[PDB]
Amino acid sequence: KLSAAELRQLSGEELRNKVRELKEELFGLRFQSATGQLENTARLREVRKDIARVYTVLQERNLNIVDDP
RNA sequence: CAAAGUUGUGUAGUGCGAUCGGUGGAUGCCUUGGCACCAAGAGCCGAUGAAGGACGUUGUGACCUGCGAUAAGCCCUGGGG
Numbered sequence A: 001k002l003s004a005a006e007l008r009q010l011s012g013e014e015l016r017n018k019v020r021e022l023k024e025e026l027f028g029l030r031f032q033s034a035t036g037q038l039e040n041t042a043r044l045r046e047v048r049k050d051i052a053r054v055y056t057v058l059q060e061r062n063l064n065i066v067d068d069p
Numbered sequence B: 001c002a003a004a005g006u007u008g009u010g011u012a013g014u015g016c017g018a019u020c021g022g023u024g025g026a027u028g029c030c031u032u033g034g035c036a037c038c039a040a041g042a043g044c045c046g047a048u049g050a051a052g053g054a055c056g057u058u059g060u061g062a063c064c065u066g067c068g069a070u071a072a073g074c075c076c077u078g079g080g081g
Ligand SMILES: [Mg+2]
Pocket: none
């Protein structure tokens, strides 16, 4: 899974929790990469892409491009 | 055999020719680059912060191109497969 437009079915607070969880996962991945672990390197970019998606949804809600749930 | 006389000279090197190579990158044939134009556009950008940059950004060392900590990319829409 890589997240998609179903993030628009979530609420603001749980989307922000999603942001925090994604940031923590990226932190762990970066530490693994530094320490020599993390064979799965593509996730290291996909997590940042997911953060971008969640910020996209939040900003469209904030700017009223899409009606806020 | 002696006497008198004649002629000859490449083991150092060199010249010329032929031949076989080396160096060199001319020539010929090209080209992801230029040059001069034609036709149609567009003729402004900027405090909603420009022109141009610095630094950063990739699974990984650099540089170029793109991008800006949402960082060779995020979303919507249409096309295409
Ligand atoms: Mg003209």
